Design a protein around this ligand. Structure first.
Ligand SMILES: CCCC(=O)OC[C@H](COP(=O)(O)O[C@H]1[C@H](O)[C@@H](OP(=O)(O)O)[C@H](OP(=O)(O)O)[C@@H](OP(=O)(O)O)[C@H]1O)O[C@H](O)CCC
Ligand SMILES: CCCC(=O)OC[C@H](COP(=O)(O)O[C@H]1[C@H](O)[C@@H](OP(=O)(O)O)[C@H](OP(=O)(O)O)[C@@H](OP(=O)(O)O)[C@H]1O)O[C@H](O)CCC
Ligand SMILES: CCCC(=O)OC[C@H](COP(=O)(O)O[C@H]1[C@H](O)[C@@H](OP(=O)(O)O)[C@H](OP(=O)(O)O)[C@@H](OP(=O)(O)O)[C@H]1O)O[C@H](O)CCC
Ligand SMILES: CCCC(=O)OC[C@H](COP(=O)(O)O[C@@H]1[C@H](O)[C@H](O)[C@@H](OP(=O)(O)O)[C@H](OP(=O)(O)O)[C@H]1O)OC(=O)CCC
Ligand SMILES: Cc1c(C)c2c(c(C)c1O)CC[C@@](C)(CCC[C@H](C)CCC[C@H](C)CCCC(C)C)O2
Ligand SMILES: Cc1c(C)c2c(c(C)c1O)CC[C@@](C)(CCC[C@H](C)CCC[C@H](C)CCCC(C)C)O2
Ligand SMILES: Cc1c(C)c2c(c(C)c1O)CC[C@@](C)(CCC[C@H](C)CCC[C@H](C)CCCC(C)C)O2
Ligand SMILES: Cc1c(C)c2c(c(C)c1O)CC[C@@](C)(CCC[C@H](C)CCC[C@H](C)CCCC(C)C)O2
Lengths: 251, 253, 251, 252
């Protein structure tokens, strides 16, 4: 790979912490692939990733799952069994299974960080990226109370050059009108390729979702072969089985 | 062959001193109000007082009903009326925002097009009985349109729609509407009865099948019909307004 | 009094609820005094009041103060010891002391209903009305989340023709600049007189407020004699002392 | 040092060699704008040329004759003195922008012209600029000119597409709607960036005197000169620079 050992010379001569993430070839590949081996942006992303980590100890330091197990058990999150036509990983998040009384927005954010770290190891996921589907049915004001400006800036960074993962699609379903109306305002001021990656489907999402993701959705969203229950429990399994590797890369 | 409440309405009108010009207080004219409220005399009277109150408060809309000043808008293709009534007998009106040039015409000019049309169709007994449905195609909506809809204009649209014109409004259909219209609808909903809320329909960009449920076999080709085009009915309606200009003069101040 | 006899008769003819608030002459005089003994206006107000009460049982049914005692102890609300120069009762509300995670907009609205039911018993308050000062310092997006269009409609009603108290002044201090844009949207839907009774004073409110309320404000707002904390405590003690009277007029 | 590596990349990447000559002084604008951080300077340089190629209707022509009418009207002046930190201080008056005669692009070109003139000053490269926008007389016709397209260009030029450090943006007499929306945008900006944006409102005299003591025109609190003075002085400087501005413009 053009820049496999080349990039490590920038890593050594800068003084990047060797722990908790061992600076292996397997770890350094994440950053190059995440920018299509553009060595220049790969280095900015690596700096931004560790900058993001040093800025957020309450989030980035701890990847140990046992703390957000209740959320996974409640069925907040599952990853689809298959990749989409572009080979991207497809993730589903379900707002109605987040209890703001029990779990804070930072706990919920950790779930994405955990999943992101496990799937980023997959080569195809590095090349093809991820698409994320947010089912906003069950949105309460108590959820909104949790999304402070500080939380929103962290969502922003992690989706744009602060994590070694291409975001290839953000899909919202069952959003409140208020979400769609505000987004309508910010939409025209966004770049051309970015507003091609954000999709607000509303309540009548059936067919737009099938255009984007044929054959691979759970029954709840128009598919025919499995349910959210299945993939949630499956993904919950994968995370708890990987809890040791997750511990070994924590602080 | 006495009409319920007509004799008494004619007396209340006289005791209150309702303006005799520009529109004469014929039986035909009074009956507009009674029919709009299904012959409930008290409600027809409250309506009739509201109608004159609204007119007096908005003379920059209500005084001049002559079409000449708004001919450009009709020529552009802003407004047409369907040939057929819907299945409940309503007149069906179509307004197309994309043919309103806001550099050229103000919100008040556009509003006058609706007043002119309403004053013409309210002469029909079947329209008095069965009301109107209006379809707004909001494709091509611009910030220039939004800025013309000042809080003042919104109040006069609300005022005129709230018990101030003797036409029953049986349905409002918006198609191709920007998402913000939904937020605006949410803000106004608590001020509406369930009956009225259920008459307002925002269909979105994928409106064709939903709007065909309401208007089978009578829409122009552009909206899923197959017998005529929008252009045909804009021309025909424009024609009719121009032939009615002598009448429209006589009911102007 | 002009119209009391006719009102008594109308009350009887129309089947106005006799419970939980008994239809004494004193109660009927609230409606007459609120409308300067204009019978038709007083009758209209009375009907609007019962209409409002029936539309909003979540607000009107319960005037028991125990559920909102926490808000009163936090220092949300007090009433000035003196009337203003025109004989109006003067109320203070401090948004910083409403925790929207703990109290809903409906709980906060109920505080005003309780206070209003208490002060409307005063003949001078019926004659001279009220002024309310809202200190919006500490306003958060989370206070905004609770002000739905439904709540906005109830607020509008009670300030205009659905509650038998003349509103002689609404003063906002430390209000976010956004309130001015909201005020522009609302103005056409209000008459010249009511718009004239709404005052937004900003962060530098002290001299403009003193023009309206010389000598009577607490120290926090430019007066000299007492603190907000004193008047919150006094008003809390009074609301709780009145708890049986309040229970006696609750459904 | 950092200059040598930048020059290498410039030759390697095929950075356009015209209209502006790629001198050591030209490259130093980019190094100084990012305090000699080579990665940041090179990124800035790349963004600058990218911005020019996407916006040739703005970037190709810096000749001032097309916008002399706007200068003569009193739209724009530069303070005779730098501020206490050495920044160049620019004043824009929306009242004197007739949006029927000049587009937002015309008005934007004035700022491009002023910027290409002051970036030549070493102390300006080092200490950046402050800009004051007097929004008295803001009309709906101005807002119509500010499309999303224009908004994106303004954001780019203020952030990472022009080699001038923006040290402060001051708005005075702004309508409520600027303040209302900005208050919604405020919490999402960084701490450093938020401390560089200042909305003074209608009562601005004291707080403006704080940031710029003894250097402002009479109109904004000073005593030594008028806006009209510095408008005319700046207009005459721009026009005396018209050959220079041609030399850094593409051919016609
Ligand atoms: O108050 P409200 O505006 O909801 O009264 C109804 C309204 O006047 C409808 O118009 C009435 O229907 P029509 O005027 O016939 O279009 C409605 O009466 P109906 O129940 O539909 O007969 C009013 O209740
Ligand atoms: O056009 P537009 O209707 O938005 O202008 C408002 C209108 O002139 C009001 O009348 C103005 O309200 P008044 O203050 O009461 O004169 C309004 O001014 P405000 O923005 O609310 O300060 C105009 O915006
Ligand atoms: O005009 P408007 O619709 O705002 O009517 C006024 C309003 O009802 C006030 O309440 C009235 O004053 P008070 O109820 O006395 O507080 C006001 O009466 P005056 O004109 O000030 O006498 C109404 O005009
Ligand atoms: C300025 C934006 C106004 C706005 O969006 O305002 C909306 C929000 C939420 O308000 P709500 O009272 O919690 O919920 C509303 C009621 O359930 C209503 O009865 C229902 O309509 P219906 O089902 O009876 O027809 C509405 O459905 P939609 O119309 O959304 O689909 C629902 O929204 O408030 C704001 O977010 C407050 C914070 C600013
Ligand atoms: C690397 C990575 C992370 C870390 C990630 C996501 C993706 C696609 C990633 O690639 C998507 C979700 C997110 C940003 C976590 C969001 C946490 C919040 C608390 C979710 C709850 C509610 C939101 C109001 C829902 C809308 C979110 C979308 C607009 C992204 O975390
Ligand atoms: C008697 C009568 C009148 C007078 C009338 C209408 C109807 C159904 C009537 O029966 C509907 C249209 C309206 C209110 C005129 C509207 C004029 C404005 C300027 C149109 C442009 C833009 C609107 C923001 C689009 C949507 C409006 C709907 C929500 C009504 O005039
Ligand atoms: C009889 C009566 C009631 C019942 C009353 C008030 C007055 C003057 C009355 O005379 C004023 C306050 C109000 C309308 C309750 C307000 C409840 C809300 C939830 C307060 C919080 C936030 C408001 C967005 C702050 C601004 C309020 C003013 C614009 C009124 O309750
Ligand atoms: C290199 C450079 C350029 C090129 C520049 C500015 C500055 C400080 C620069 O360093 C400031 C102004 C701007 C961005 C051009 C503005 C053009 C528009 C059409 C002005 C009119 C109206 C604005 C909506 C007023 C407020 C703008 C502030 C929010 C910046 O051009």
């Amino acid at each position: 790979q053009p820049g496999l050992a080349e990039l490590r010379r920038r890593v050594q001569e800068a003084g990047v912490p060797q722990t908790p993430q061992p600076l292996t070839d397997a770890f350094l590949l994440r950053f190059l692939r995440a920018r299509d081996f553009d060595l220049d942006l790969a280095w900015r992303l690596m700096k931004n990733y560790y900058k993001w980590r040093a800025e957020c100890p309450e989030l980035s330091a701890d990847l140990r799952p046992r703390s957000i197990l209740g959320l996974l058990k409640a069925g907040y999150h599952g990853v689809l069994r298959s990749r989409d036509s572009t080979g991207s990983r497809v993730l589903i998040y379900r707002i109605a299974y987040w209890d703001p009384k029990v779990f804070t927005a930072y706990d919920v954010f950790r779930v994405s960080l955990i999943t992101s770290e496990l799937i980023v190891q997959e080569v195809e996921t590095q090349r093809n990226g991820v698409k994320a589907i947010f089912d906003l049915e069950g949105w309460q004001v108590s959820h909104a109370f949790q999304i402070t400006p500080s939380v929103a800036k962290k969502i922003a960074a992690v989706l744009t050059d602060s994590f070694p993962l291409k975001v290839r699609g953000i899909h919202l379903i069952n959003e409140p009108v208020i979400f769609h109306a505000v987004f309508s305002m910010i939409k025209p001021f966004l770049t051309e390729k970015i507003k091609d990656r954000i999709h607000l489907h509303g309540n009548n999402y059936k067919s737009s979702m099938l255009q984007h993701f044929p054959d691979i959705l759970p029954r709840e969203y128009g598919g025919k072969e499995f349910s959210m229950e299945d993939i949630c429990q499956e993904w919950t399994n994968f995370i708890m089985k990987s809890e040791d590797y997750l511990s070994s890369i924590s602080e």
